[PDB]
Amino acid sequence: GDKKVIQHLNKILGNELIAINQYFLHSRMWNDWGLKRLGAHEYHESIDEMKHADKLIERILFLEGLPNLQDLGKLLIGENTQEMLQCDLNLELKATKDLREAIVHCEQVHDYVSRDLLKDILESEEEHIDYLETQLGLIQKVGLENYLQSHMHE
Amino acid sequence: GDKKVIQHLNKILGNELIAINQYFLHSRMWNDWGLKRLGAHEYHESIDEMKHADKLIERILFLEGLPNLQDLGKLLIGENTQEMLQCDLNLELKATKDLREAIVHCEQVHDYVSRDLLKDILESEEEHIDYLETQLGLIQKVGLENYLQSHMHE
Amino acid sequence: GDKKVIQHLNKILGNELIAINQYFLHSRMWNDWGLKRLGAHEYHESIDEMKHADKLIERILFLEGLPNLQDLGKLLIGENTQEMLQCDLNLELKATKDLREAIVHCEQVHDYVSRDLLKDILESEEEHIDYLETQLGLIQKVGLENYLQSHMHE
Amino acid sequence: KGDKKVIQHLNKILGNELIAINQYFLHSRMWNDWGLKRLGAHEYHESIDEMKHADKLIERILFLEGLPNLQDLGKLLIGENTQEMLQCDLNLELKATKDLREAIVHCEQVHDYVSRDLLKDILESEEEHIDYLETQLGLIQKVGLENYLQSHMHE
Amino acid sequence: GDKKVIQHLNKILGNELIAINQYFLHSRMWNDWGLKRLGAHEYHESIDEMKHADKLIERILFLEGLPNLQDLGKLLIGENTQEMLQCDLNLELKATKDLREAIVHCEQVHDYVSRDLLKDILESEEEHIDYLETQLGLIQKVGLENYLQSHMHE
Amino acid sequence: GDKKVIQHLNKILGNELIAINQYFLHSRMWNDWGLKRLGAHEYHESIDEMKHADKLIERILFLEGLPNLQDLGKLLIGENTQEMLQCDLNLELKATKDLREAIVHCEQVHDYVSRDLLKDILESEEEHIDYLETQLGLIQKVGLENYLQSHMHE
């Protein structure tokens, strides 16, 4: 395994570890508030990041690297829906930037299978950014109270 | 086939081509904004127009004319939901005036089969006018924020 | 969204718009002549270009560009089977060149998801080029009258 | 022959059902025209329910050898928005319900207990409708008109 | 919506409302007399008139008129079977004339969709006339008592 | 029933009776030569003219006219496939001229039900003309021998 590919994979893994926990807490926060539709969506976002982290770990081990599950960066926990959403979007913009940089490096050292893995994850982060931006646009078009209302029942 | 009948059929065809693209863009714009119910409905109007164009094209060829799929008129693209709906309405008002003129002419040269085709297309356009007026009317009764909220989910 | 990426996507979109109409007319002309297998095949090629255009449109909007459905370039309509197939082929040869330039660009600016979309479109257009070259060669191998005979029934 | 005054009361109730049938059917269609499909559908079923009540009256009248009267159509109360339409329906049912009660008292007095029974079933049904109508009007006040109509766009 | 179109639709509606009541009473009369087959058939006629009225009402509201369900013309109630049949027949010959006049006017102002609705209704009144004349002929061919006997059982 | 409407119905009916026998005989001549796909198809054209004659007869009778089945016009019988197709084509062009004339007259005396019937019949005859011109066109494009070959098996 190329040494820097493995550092980039561990970096992306560290970003997923953060998103897993952040999305999971935001999910349960929305469930505690009775916003059950947001809560279920956010749960599914968290599970998706668990699956990404799984593939990164398996790839790092195959490359005879040491996956790092020990270092957990900073969770961005919001205190209301508008902020929680904005916090997910800020995490995703950072994650996406780290992914692009990992993919440049993989391309450069001809690790095309790691690059393919990272590109599938990048596509799924960009779908999430699409979700998030649409939600924040909806809060402006329908009003915050209507937006929350629409997210009470599953 | 009557030469003028064929110009009228191409005229109608040209108008369907415009509505296909306009409704199709308006659909995808609504989806992008998270108003999926509007997006789904408008997708279906686009497909309906596709199906009318197909039958125009087939009639023109049976009559031994040359279907004109080269000339694309002006799309009326809205910038928000009330504009988009009004744009679609303005386009249907014009399509329907053209459909009436074509039918007058078909009757006068006794092309009753073209006439009947055009009559089915008109009745469908009039149902879309019905839908569109009703939507603009709902926006006034329930208010724009409610109207949008009601179209967030399919 | 990168502004040159978006311009490339609109350029590809413009090519798909041309292909959709050209193939659709070509399908209906073949059906008008009783060459129903050609006609059904070209119908499916048209529908495929429609799906590509839809994905291009969704991507542009996600990158916050303006999809351009207004500008419709030159349709190459043949007047017999051999010309129609050659027209479709000339069109794909140009479509495919624009796709390669567009991918080079998306790669350079790290828009790997756009690259991925374009690469799928490209695979689908190279499949269409395989079919076209194959039909041209069969005309030579079995003679035009037999070729056409073989395409009367679906 | 049935009792003459019974037959007159039955034709009276029948007159009230003919009005409700037309009024409810027009309100339903106006609600559908406006995209308030859920009000449209419910009101349609109210019209249909009155059509069935009218059928049973017509049948009973003929059994008692009277002449069902379908020629005289009293005055439709047509509202011009949703709150008005619900209040018009309600005004009609308050009146229908008073007439049913008088018709039932007469039936008892002349021992036509089968006619009483038919009217008691009509009455229960018209009282349900009154429950529905006052509930909607109460909901307009609790959730606000705009929300209320919003909740009735879709079936 | 054309003022005289609406007036004509509202006149056809008036004829439908008379027919609903007339056919319904007549059904119930035949049932009270034990001619259940006649009763069942007249019940179905009534129901068809109620469906035509529904369509007229919906068309009037689309054209932005006021449906008139207030004025109720005069029911032709028969006192025996032969008379009940002739009465429905006189009423149908009238409806049929008014429909023809409504259709002339629709044609002349190009309200072709109203015309097509009117034509469907008219086709259905002509079927009812076929039935009614046939029934009157049968009374002469088989005699009244046999005709009535034949209509006792559903 | 309008007297001239009835003459026009009888005229159309006579045309149908000619088509029934001509198509039927053409069918059985194709079966006898072992061109079964032509034979099957022509059989179905004959059945269809049988259904049209049925509808004309019923209408004529309802209008109190006398259906004329006694007079049978001149059958156009070809002696080979190209001639048979052209004969069927010459017959349909005539039927179709007579249909238009009958429709003018029904419009002018307000028999809109007769007109609807004839109009269905006219659309079905134009579909037949489409099929016929396509076959003669295929003969030229694939060559007579290939065209017949392709019609050997059902």
Next chain:
Amino acid sequence: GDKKVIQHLNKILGNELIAINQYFLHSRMWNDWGLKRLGAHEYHESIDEMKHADKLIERILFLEGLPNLQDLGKLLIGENTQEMLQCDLNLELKATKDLREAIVHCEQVHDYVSRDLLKDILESEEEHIDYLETQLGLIQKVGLENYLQSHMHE
């Protein structure tokens, strides 16, 4: 194929063409009068004649003769039920006579397959005569009015 056999076959065919039209118009007259049971029975007799004419056409073509579908003999149309049934019988007595002579001739020149086909047709015409004589019998036994009453419903 023997020349006089072909003449006979063409003669029987001609009789079947008269029956087809006569029975079919009778059926539709009975349906127009509301005597649906007679109408359905008579419809099936017309269909059976159509099938016989098909077999005659087929055999004539096989034997290298020209089926004659051009020369339609005289239709016996009754004005009422008893006449209509007597006209069918008169027609069948004549048909039956011609069949006998055709069969003598087939036998004499040894065309035993032609004789078998005509024998099958004869048996079916004799079944028809049985039905016809039975109906005329019943008219006498149950009275005309009862007879007609029993044929209103199918």
